[PDB]
Amino acid sequence: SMSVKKPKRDDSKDLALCSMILTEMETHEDAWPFLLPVNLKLVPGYKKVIKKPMDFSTIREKLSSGQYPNLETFALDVRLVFDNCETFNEDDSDIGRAGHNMRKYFEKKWTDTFK
């Protein structure tokens, strides 16, 4: 509350560390469904169904231009990518499996870097 603060957690390396995680997600062999925005002209149903499209290249541009206020807003966009994937793709599909794989990969790096 006013003039009453918990001890200051050091967030000065968060930008660099999120960038490293994102580089590892970019280079994973199962990243290919997530590298670029879904083409809304060429994929029937995507525009109407997926209210907030997100992909790794859009997160990379947001990260590089100071559009994440803190490390939690960064994780929310990464998780959005996977939530969108599960909304649109069957689990028993190459893309559906890729999304599960990458979500696991992310959540481990997240825990190990920050928790």
From Swiss-Prot:
Residues 9-113 form the Bromo domain. Expressed at varying levels in several tissues, whereas a smaller transcript was expressed specifically in testis. It is found in: Nucleus. Regulatory subunit of the ATP-dependent BRF-1 and BRF-5 ISWI chromatin remodeling complexes, which form ordered nucleosome arrays on chromatin and facilitate access to DNA during DNA-templated processes such as DNA replication, transcription, and repair. Both complexes regulate the spacing of nucleosomes along the chromatin and have the ability to slide mononucleosomes to the center of a DNA template. The BRF-1 ISWI chromatin remodeling complex has a lower ATP hydrolysis rate than the BRF-5 ISWI chromatin remodeling complex. Component of the BRF-1 ISWI chromatin remodeling complex, at least composed of SMARCA1 and BAZ2B, which regulates the spacing of histone octamers on the DNA template to facilitate access to DNA. Within the BRF-1 ISWI chromatin remodeling complex interacts with SMARCA1; the interaction is direct. Component of the BRF-5 ISWI chromatin remodeling complex, at least composed of SMARCA5/SNF2H and BAZ2B, which regulates the spacing of histone octamers on the DNA template to facilitate access to DNA. Belongs to the WAL family. This is Bromodomain adjacent to zinc finger domain protein 2B. The gene is BAZ2B.
